[model samples]
Target: EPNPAYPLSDQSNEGDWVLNTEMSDEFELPLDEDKWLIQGRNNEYQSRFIGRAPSQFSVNNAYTESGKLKIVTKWEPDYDFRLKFNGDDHDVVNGEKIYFENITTAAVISKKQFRYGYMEIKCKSANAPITSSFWTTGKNTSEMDMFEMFGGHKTNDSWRKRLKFNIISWDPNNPNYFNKINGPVFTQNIQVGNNTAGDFHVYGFDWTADYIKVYYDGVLLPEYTILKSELTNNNTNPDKWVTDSDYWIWFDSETFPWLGIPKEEDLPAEYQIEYLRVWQKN
Candidate 1:
């Protein structure tokens, strides 16, 4: 049976469910600028550079076409440069120089925000070395990851399990940290039936006050709880769930060499988003 928390139909009126926001770009019109902000910044998790300047993230990289929002990633030799961890320039790795560039396109939901709700997205992952993600973050560093796919091959190996679901938060007392201890609260890798990059899939999560449940194609995964207690071997503070605040959504793609650099043959790849919808409890 389908979970009542998430309605399977496009419309719902189950007494406990209320529609919040639904965004579907049929590629017929321009993106609603008032609702979205083209991200031109780098991510803290992985210091991969973002190309937000004129040459990067132009309309050519992100656009609506064929009834879907397409985000394309391209590779370049010595595209740009990244600073060293010591704040010095000219960082070197594996006896080679590391470069940075605006390699991808990203956007964030600026106007809409939610707390406990049912959220989902329909998207196809990109190719290797490129990652596609649909996640959320609040004003104070609280976060919940609905899905992040590595865009690599699908096999039984560890790297083949490219999909992940996670939850992150920062302790109020420790303003600059991730959790109370400055680390991820919860994380889990997931495996699906086929290569995520090869097809479109519905990925989502039910974020309620008590627990967070992750799902793929309406089926729940086994390791779905993300509370601090569950993440810290039941030894952490039980009341320290960091995802209770309102959060905005983000859909982006990035590349990290540590994951696996793309070969020249895979130079150009794309991640396409069919639609995004959110529902709240009434």
Candidate 2:
């Protein structure tokens, strides 16, 4: 069974999808470690990834309140920054030493995996320099970036209203996010009429064998499509559409130096996720 508000797709093809409750989350109280491998907290799992400079992924930043999963990015000068994860610290950002009070964000990866289906999320981005992302990846290095939004970018005003989407198949042996079989491919950016951080909106993607389309607020975006030929793997993929390797969903708030760092005023910003629902026909 699924929630009463199951989303619909505008794609020509349709299927009878059933909600995969095990793969979906309402993010209510009592966080489930078996289902969510929270960064900086799930010490048992090895993660080679780390947030961008001047910010650290903090376990204390994520929590559940009133049936909503709230991930916060905080500006804390006094909080200790001794936690360890993958990647090294960057000393400089935008040509200056980052000596300001450090920022701490949150990230959570689904322990379970999903192949291909309709992935939907209802949320609002943090009105800060950080990014709120809903994406997927696998051990084999297949990555699908559904949406990456920077709610409060300092320089580019358009960035605050845009959703960046990218499809990538990284070199499995390379062990670096930037290294790909033939470099990264197929990137698309869509903009909403208003700032994404203003309110909650339903964002989704219909990823199937033949095509892919993005949805905003339960409606299809205008004149956008990701054809099969556009989804390139360069022989690094394990299956169809880049890779059929099962994927773990990720909900994260991270720093991007290019967008500028969060100042003290944007402190205590929150990325609120009402729910993440997955549906599959097969």
Candidate 3:
């Protein structure tokens, strides 16, 4: 039976579903083809200002048993890793920062103007101590956040572990563009430990010209429909929206100190992903 929450649009093109397995050039790794973007060690945009922790986070080739991409982070006697404890501050060692180690465990493939589409992923985590995400960063020079998942910790600390979904629409003409860039105009917070780390689950979105809706395991959690005037007004404001530039969605290991702070002792973390698929009308 089809989920009633997901209505089949009479105009929706079923042909839009494309298999993005390793079979397709877009999914191939070691990325000599330029179809996919992988940010591991020694990529083009490696800078100290970005998510940088020495020898802490790495997209290790050591484990690929499942054929699915496994982003591994660990702590060993020979190896010292930095765990992002809290926002901005990291564990310091020898006048250097430790636990700032983060792996660029994200990928971006193919960009298209998806006016209306269904995007979904099946994924799981390797441990409860790590954070993971399966999300889309942009579309046709625009930034659209499809989804983001942060690991849920069972600590009494209120903000240490939680899951979040953010959708930011850019409008240069709006007066509050900077404020919105600092945060999403539309956001959702799901309670941590919704069984995220224990096993794989489905997270998805149904995006349209007028609205963007979010779901977990085929269940609708929230929806938003925007007014055309608002989008136009945003576009017209130079300070708010950069209508001229391409916007991108990104997965970051960067930590925020809403809880106390992260420490080096909190090592051995991993994020695993199974697959992602998208569908839209012709």
User: lDDT (CA) for every model shown?
Assistant: 0.60, 0.74, 0.44
Candidate 3 residue lDDT tens string, 1-282: 543223233123343444333322211244332433344435333212333443333334223336444555455435434334345446554475555443322333332223345666555653434446544433323355554444545463232323565545445444444344666544566544356666776666666654556666666564333333464574463332323233222333433334222344554555555544555444
Candidate 2 structure quality by residue, lDDT tens digits, 1-282? 333346655243356676788778888766787778777674543255545556766788888777778889998877665433433345465577543247888788888888878888889999999998988888766788888899988788798898888777664554333454454456778788778899998887877766777888778885667766544444354233564557888888888776678898988898889988888875
Candidate 1 residue lDDT tens string, 6-44: 445423445266667443233346666556655543332
How well does candidate 1 match the true structure in TM-score terms? 0.75
Name the better of 2 and 3 by lDDT. 2
Candidates 1 and 3 compared by lDDT, better number: 1
Q: Which stretches of candidate 2 lie over 4 Å from their true place?
A: 1-5, 10-13, 42-46, 83-87, 91-101, 172-177, 180-183, 230-243
TM per candidate: 0.75, 0.84, 0.60
Q: For model 2, what is the alpha-carbon lDDT of residue 122?
A: 86
The Cα error of candidate 1 at residue 174, in Å, is: 4.5
- Candidate 3: how many backbone clashes? 17
- Candidate 1's displacement at residue 115, Å, is 1.3
Candidate with more favorable, higher TM-score: 1 or 3: 1
List the candidates ranked by TM-score, beginning with the highest. Answer: 2, 1, 3
